Amino acid sequence: PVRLCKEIELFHFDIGPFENMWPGIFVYMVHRSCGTSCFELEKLCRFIMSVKKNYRRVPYHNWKHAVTVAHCMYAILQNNHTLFTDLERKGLLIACLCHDLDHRGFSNSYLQKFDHPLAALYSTSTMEQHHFSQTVSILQLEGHNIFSTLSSSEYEQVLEIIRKAIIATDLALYFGNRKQLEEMYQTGSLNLNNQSHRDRVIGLMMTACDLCSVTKLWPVTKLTANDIYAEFWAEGDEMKKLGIQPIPMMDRDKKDEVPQGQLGFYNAVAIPCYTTLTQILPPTEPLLKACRDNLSQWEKVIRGE
Numbered sequence: 001p002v003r004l005c006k007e008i009e010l011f012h013f014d015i016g017p018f019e020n021m022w023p024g025i026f027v028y029m030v031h032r033s034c035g036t037s038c039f040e041l042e043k044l045c046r047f048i049m050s051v052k053k054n055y056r057r058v059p060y061h062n063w064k065h066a067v068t069v070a071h072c073m074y075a076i077l078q079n080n081h082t083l084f085t086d087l088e089r090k091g092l093l094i095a096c097l098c099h100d101l102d103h104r105g106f107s108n109s110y111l112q113k114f115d116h117p118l119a120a121l122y123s124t125s126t127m128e129q130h131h132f133s134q135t136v137s138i139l140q141l142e143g144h145n146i147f148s149t150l151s152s153s154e155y156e157q158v159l160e161i162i163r164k165a166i167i168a169t170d171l172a173l174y175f176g177n178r179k180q181l182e183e184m185y186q187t188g189s190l191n192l193n194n195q196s197h198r199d200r201v202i203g204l205m206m207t208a209c210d211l212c213s214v215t216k217l218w219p220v221t222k223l224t225a226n227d228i229y230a231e232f233w234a235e236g237d238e239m240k241k242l243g244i245q246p247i248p249m250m251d252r253d254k255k256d257e258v259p260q261g262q263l264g265f266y267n268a269v270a271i272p273c274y275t276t277l278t279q280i281l282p283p284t285e286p287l288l289k290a291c292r293d294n295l296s297q298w299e300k301v302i303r304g305e
């Protein structure tokens, strides 16, 4: 539709009301960002449908989250087009769509605490290493290799861009990454032609995209909070059955602590993320402004309004 082609370019865009159109919205974004002759359309369409099939029916880490994260990346890339190569633009849009593949609704700490087989196989960034392994398995299916036309060198480079992008969605790594970028920016040392600086900037873009549900209009942001919390409470219920007391955010008997938990998450994680992203990429400012608006809505809930 002509109506949506205009709205897809904006940062605040909510995909929510167009479920049947999500596969077509992704194809359109790859076409406008990387060109209409980037991939073979038959191969791309099979890949998108196999990716959709490998997202589980969980309240938050599902097919909708994947398309939401991919659309945020598209809007960042469209507002900063010439800072990235054709291989990076295609690698990053794919990485976002595949970033939480086969998520079972449990965090890394639960899998490490209860010594699940995935934790023995992957000791750090447990789920993110699993998300990358699932992406490679889907690429290796008959008629799913979207990167068939690349040279063997370019195939290895794009898989390495994707691997680093998926691993960077581990929030535990974000804190140290953001502190380095903030230092590099203030001292005037940041340089995008330095490959180590480039990977860190890409990592922060991935965090900004993964947390973008805090940058939508208030009625949408508050309905997404219900879905994150239904996942956290289900994990906390399992910890209770196994004789371990869960942290407050994962405890369904401590809902009163949520508005204050959100205020702390916005001040310590979300606001610094979008602040540093705007300093490095000024056109991303609308994400920071939307985040400040939802912070001020959480301030209003705490004060009783």
Ligand SMILES: COc1cc(C)c2nc3[nH]nc(C)c3c(N3CCNCC3)c2c1
Residues within 6 Å of the ligand: 171, 211, 213, 214, 225, 228, 249, 261, 262, 265
């Ligand atoms: C782990 O501790 C927390 C604690 C709080 C209070 C959170 N509040 C949030 N609001 N919106 C989002 C999104 C979100 C969080 N997530 C960050 C990315 N990983 C999924 C969960 C949060 C994560």
Ligand SMILES: [Mg+2]
Residues within 6 Å of the ligand: 099, 100, 169, 170
């Ligand atoms: Mg993830």
Ligand SMILES: [Zn+2]
Residues within 6 Å of the ligand: 065, 069, 099, 100, 169, 210
């Ligand atoms: Zn995610």
